[PDB]
């Protein structure tokens, strides 16, 4: 009933329930930045600091998911994630950091992706638990 795949599902669930909130915070910070002297400069820079800071966690979570579902023989779900790998590579090439449209659009798309992956992981885990 466990098969070590339910564990990866649980982990990814706990780990993406943070990314949904992270992306919601991205969206709200974009809404706040929509207002585009020293006061506003600070209100923008102190937030863009955290914005640029909390990018490595995405790499971490995604490499973790990939590795787990790779050595866990969970092949179906890996294909659902490798395109995001190619996207992250094309972003590391050079990120568009003219700058708000792509930001908000990628945030929306990634939020939808994570919100759907949460449900998909819960689904696969509920199926793997009652497989007996």
């Amino acid at each position: 009933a466990f098969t070590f795949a339910a564990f990866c599902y649980m982990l990814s669930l706990v780990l993406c329930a943070a990314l949904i909130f992270f992306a919601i915070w991205h969206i709200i910070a974009f809404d706040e930045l929509r207002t585009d002297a020293r006061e506003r400069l600070r209100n923008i820079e102190r937030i863009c600091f955290l914005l640029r800071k909390l990018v490595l966690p995405e790499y971490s979570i995604h490499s973790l998911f990939c590795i787990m579902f790779l050595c866990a023989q969970e092949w179906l779900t890996l294909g659902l994630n490798v395109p995001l790998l190619f996207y992250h590579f094309w972003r590391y090439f050079h990120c568009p950091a003219d700058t708000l449209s792509y930001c908000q659009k990628e945030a929306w798309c990634k939020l939808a992706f994570y919100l759907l992956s949460f449900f998909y992981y819960l689904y696969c885990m509920i199926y793997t638990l009652v497989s007996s």
């Binding site: 009933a1 466990f2 070590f4 564990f7 649980m10 669930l13 706990v14 780990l15 329930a17 909130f21």
Partner: protein, 378 residues
Amino acid sequence: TVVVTTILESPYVMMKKNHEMLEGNERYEGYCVDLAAEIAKHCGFKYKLTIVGDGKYGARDADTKIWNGMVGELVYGKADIAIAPLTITLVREEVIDFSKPFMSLGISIMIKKPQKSKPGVFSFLDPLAYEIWMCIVFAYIGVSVVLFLVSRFSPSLSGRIVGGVWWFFTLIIISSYTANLAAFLTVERMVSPIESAEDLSKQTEIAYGTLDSGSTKEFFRRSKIAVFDKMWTYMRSAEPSVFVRTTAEGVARVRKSKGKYAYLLESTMNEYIEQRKPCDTMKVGGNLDSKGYGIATPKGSSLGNAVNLAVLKLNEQGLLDKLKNKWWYDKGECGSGTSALSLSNVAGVFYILVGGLGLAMLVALIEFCYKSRAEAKR
């Protein structure tokens, strides 16, 4: 054609699915049927099968002085030849001509097959009571609280000794858990269930019994072997009665029991039962005694010397083994019948791990909110 008296013991002789629309020798089926077919092909005769009225094989009575069953049918001309599991015995060899054994067998052991491998989700808590687990949890949180207080109001000699006493505490706790777990695993490991009869004589937890009417107890009685002597002593002074009536009950009472009862019966019947639903039995201990089944025939007959040769020919050609496989294993409804730690023993650990991880993520998110909002914006 030639009369052939037999008996309705499975799987030797059995009826078809619908024995109402069937007539003649085509009604029956079983090992003995193909055996008789081969004997006919060898000696070249047409035969008619019959069933014994008394449903018995044969034996005398201290007063009647008359052989009953198929042996009686053979003695008193009621049948010209018997093809059935007619055990060979001294008393019977003095009145008929047993052929050479077409099946050698003996007494065996039968037990409830072991398949109990469903460990609880939180079995890892069994080594020591849950009381200690709760005490451990609350001691951990209390020590954390004390360290927090100390390091907060007096920013040492207190931290050092709380650390030392916690070192002692965990040193003893991990070891108290590990040692009891090792005891559990070891005691569960060095339990040789059974491999022979002596494995039962030198123990009394797994009781065992025989039938209340048969040559099994007779073999156990008037026996010199100290093992069987002790076993007869046990079964005779047993309470409740290890002995039982017809085999079906002795089988069911071990089917229900987990590992407490064993039934000593005929090895062949044990193998047959092992290949029938619900497939919860097994035979491992080698046969104790050594006997055989043979094709009988009236003493003053002409087929004895023409039947022994056929039996030996079929035994050498391997036809008898073929038929035994056909009617015990091929026809078997049970075709299928570790040391490491399966995850099932440790699942709860990972369950609580992920629970704590999710709780920590929740706490961190709400703290991030209550901090950033209230400080920067609110």
